[PDB]
Amino acid sequence: AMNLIFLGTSAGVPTRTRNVTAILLNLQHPTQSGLWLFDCGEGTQHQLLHTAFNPGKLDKIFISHLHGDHLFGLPGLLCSRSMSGIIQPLTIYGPQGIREFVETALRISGSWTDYPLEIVEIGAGEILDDGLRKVTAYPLEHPLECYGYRIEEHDAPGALNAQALKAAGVPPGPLFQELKAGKTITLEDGRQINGADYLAAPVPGKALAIFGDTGPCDAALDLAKGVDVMVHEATLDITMEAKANSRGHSSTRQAATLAREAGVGKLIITHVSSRYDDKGCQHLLRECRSIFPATELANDFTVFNV
Amino acid sequence: AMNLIFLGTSAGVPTRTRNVTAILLNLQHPTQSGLWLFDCGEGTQHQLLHTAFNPGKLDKIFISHLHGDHLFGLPGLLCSRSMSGIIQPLTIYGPQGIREFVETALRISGSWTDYPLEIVEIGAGEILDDGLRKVTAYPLEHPLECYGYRIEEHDAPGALNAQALKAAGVPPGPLFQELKAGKTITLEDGRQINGADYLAAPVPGKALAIFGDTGPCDAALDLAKGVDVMVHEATLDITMEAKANSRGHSSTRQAATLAREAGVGKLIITHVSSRYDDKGCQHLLRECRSIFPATELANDFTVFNV
Ligand SMILES: [Zn+2]
Ligand SMILES: [Zn+2]
Ligand SMILES: [Zn+2]
Numbered sequence: 001a002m003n004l005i006f007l008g009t010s011a012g013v014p015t016r017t018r019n020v021t022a023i024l025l026n027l028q029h030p031t032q033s034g035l036w037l038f039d040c041g042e043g044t045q046h047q048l049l050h051t052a053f054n055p056g057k058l059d060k061i062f063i064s065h066l067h068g069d070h071l072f073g074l075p076g077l078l079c080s081r082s083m084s085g086i087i088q089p090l091t092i093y094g095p096q097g098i099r100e101f102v103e104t105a106l107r108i109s110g111s112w113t114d115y116p117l118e119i120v121e122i123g124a125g126e127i128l129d130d131g132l133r134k135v136t137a138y139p140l141e142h143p144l145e146c147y148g149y150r151i152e153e154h155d156a157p158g159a160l161n162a163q164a165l166k167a168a169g170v171p172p173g174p175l176f177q178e179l180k181a182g183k184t185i186t187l188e189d190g191r192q193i194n195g196a197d198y199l200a201a202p203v204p205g206k207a208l209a210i211f212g213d214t215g216p217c218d219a220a221l222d223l224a225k226g227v228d229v230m231v232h233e234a235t236l237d238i239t240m241e242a243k244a245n246s247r248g249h250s251s252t253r254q255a256a257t258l259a260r261e262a263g264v265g266k267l268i269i270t271h272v273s274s275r276y277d278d279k280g281c282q283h284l285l286r287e288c289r290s291i292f293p294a295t296e297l298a299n300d301f302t303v304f305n306v
Numbered sequence: 307a308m309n310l311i312f313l314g315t316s317a318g319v320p321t322r323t324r325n326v327t328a329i330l331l332n333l334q335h336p337t338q339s340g341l342w343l344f345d346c347g348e349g350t351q352h353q354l355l356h357t358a359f360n361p362g363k364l365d366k367i368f369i370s371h372l373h374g375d376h377l378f379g380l381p382g383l384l385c386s387r388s389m390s391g392i393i394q395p396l397t398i399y400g401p402q403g404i405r406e407f408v409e410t411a412l413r414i415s416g417s418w419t420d421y422p423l424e425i426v427e428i429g430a431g432e433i434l435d436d437g438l439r440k441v442t443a444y445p446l447e448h449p450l451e452c453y454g455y456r457i458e459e460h461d462a463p464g465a466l467n468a469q470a471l472k473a474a475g476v477p478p479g480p481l482f483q484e485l486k487a488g489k490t491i492t493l494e495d496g497r498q499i500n501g502a503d504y505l506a507a508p509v510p511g512k513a514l515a516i517f518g519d520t521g522p523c524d525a526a527l528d529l530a531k532g533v534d535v536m537v538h539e540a541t542l543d544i545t546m547e548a549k550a551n552s553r554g555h556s557s558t559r560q561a562a563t564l565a566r567e568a569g570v571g572k573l574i575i576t577h578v579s580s581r582y583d584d585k586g587c588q589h590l591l592r593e594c595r596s597i598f599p600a601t602e603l604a605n606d607f608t609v610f611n612v
């Protein structure tokens with residue numbers, strides 16, 4: 001369950017090596033094994049096309065903000081989806097204007113969809129409840145209304161300790177069913193056993209925070225708070241922190257420090273400036289690591305376990 | 307002077323091997339050495355970025371029609387142009403709606419340009435006169451208003467035959483200047499020489515026809531008429547001619563036959579269906595060739611001399 005597949009990792013504009021923003025979320029569930037997409041910069045559909053993922057599995061698309069490097073690319077994807085035989089329904093979630101944009105693009109281009117498409121203009125707060133996980137939007141600091149997304153899968157109820165029960169005399173099968181239900185079923189050995197003393201340790205869910213572009217901000221800490229994996233931009237190095245901050249971006253240290261401040265398992269930085277070359281990106285990594293060793297650099301097509 | 311650089315050659319949707327439509331026209335002139343772009347499907351700017359062409363030289367963009375596979379990609383290019391330091395002015399020519407599309411995209415995405423941008427809603431007829439060449443729009447048969455573009459460079463006035471003059475006694479230099487002007491300057495050898503009898507054979511210009519998507523149509527022959535190079539779609543093979551024609555497309559034979567009918571030097575087919583693989587595209591080529599041997603298959607990044 002839960003995989004991140006980076007399609008684009010470049011700030012603002014594409015480069016020979018990194019395409020603009022798009023992050024894929026593979027949700028491997030027993031009955032919810034679908035695909036989710038966070039952002040859609042130009043070329044996203046191309047990027048996808050080169051992977052073996054089934055474009056049909058993708059059912060939801062979450063846009064953080066409407067800047068070209070996170071949005072242009074969506075109209076083409078929608079048309080390509082339809083031109084394939086995909087008919088599985090699709091839902092887009094994003095800030096106001098998202099609907100006007102998509103509609104206009106489709107209108108003028110003489111396009112449609114042969115699959116039901118639902119566009120949802122969102123705002124801060126819970127966005128949806130899978131029944132298995134919930135997504136929550138958090139407002140960030142950026143030139144355009146921009147949301148971060150916290151994806152949390154509800155905690156799994158603690159399961160019965162089969163071994164402990166077997167140890168206690170309860171045989172597998174018959175009264176096993178009942179003890180499962182909760183019944184305080186008594187044993188032929190003259191002894192009552194309350195299944196509630198064996199349904200131990202209810203495993204907590206995995207927590208993921210995919211941020212939208214942002215400079216330091218209040219809500220930032222909430223989104224991050226103890227999440228397993230935190231995806232955060234690191235557009236510029238420390239010496240450019242002011243430049244970054246002025247445009248709604250964060251510096252290497254700012255991201256790492258927030259990681260630390262929020263006690264998150266792993267930090268994945270992206271949206272790196274086209275100004276830095278491969279080595280420059282390793283220098284960015286070092287900056288983050290020397291303030292939070294558990295940081296990694298995303299790359300086009302790089303994968304991550306939540 | 308005059309080069310075609312194909313950026314995308316795929317019908318409707320991108321593929322692992324061919325991107326959607328975009329054709330580059332390199333105009334190498336003594337004082338007009340700029341770049342021209344015909345169509346802008348998604349990924350066009352990416353495609354460009356991988357070539358050594360100076361994106362700054364590009365000053366004009368011609369859109370045949372507004373279908374996504376010829377249009378999405380334009381907004382991203384404009385933003386990237388501006389994000390570089392490009393300031394050289396840019397002009398877009400295309401059917402109605404082109405302006406509304408570009409503007410809306412830029413508005414919603416919170417973008418601008420730091421270079422003057424001129425959008426021009428066109429219709430049939432001459433589009434511009436370079437002074438060196440003229441571009442003319444021709445209406446075609448397709449689900450959306452779609453124009454073909456004839457680019458003709460005016461004929462070069464015949465130059466003076468230096469040799470013939472030297473043969474006739476006229477020395478290089480002095481009276482050479484005058485004979486150039488037209489003066490019937492007389493020679494010391496007692497003899498008048500009218501420069502008009504030496505300014506021989508006025509070389510005709512090169513003629514290029516970049517078609518937009520189309521099924522057979524009346525105007526098609528005009529656009530094509532004797533042009534040096536004819537770029538025409540060949541979306542489907544002969545056995546699919548009806549399917550093709552029903553959607554505003556042409557079959558292999560239809561394109562070749564029009565080539566022949568119009569007496570054009572070379573035929574370059576593109577906008578091939580993602581349905582055909584490499585071999586299938588060679589089968590498409592054969593079809594064209596057996597009705598007009600001078601046909602070639604465009605490929606992403608393939609170049610052509612007009
Ligand atoms: Zn961005
Ligand atoms: Zn942004
Ligand atoms: Zn087309």
Ligand SMILES: [Zn+2]
Pocket residue numbers: 371373448519
């Ligand atoms: Zn079309």
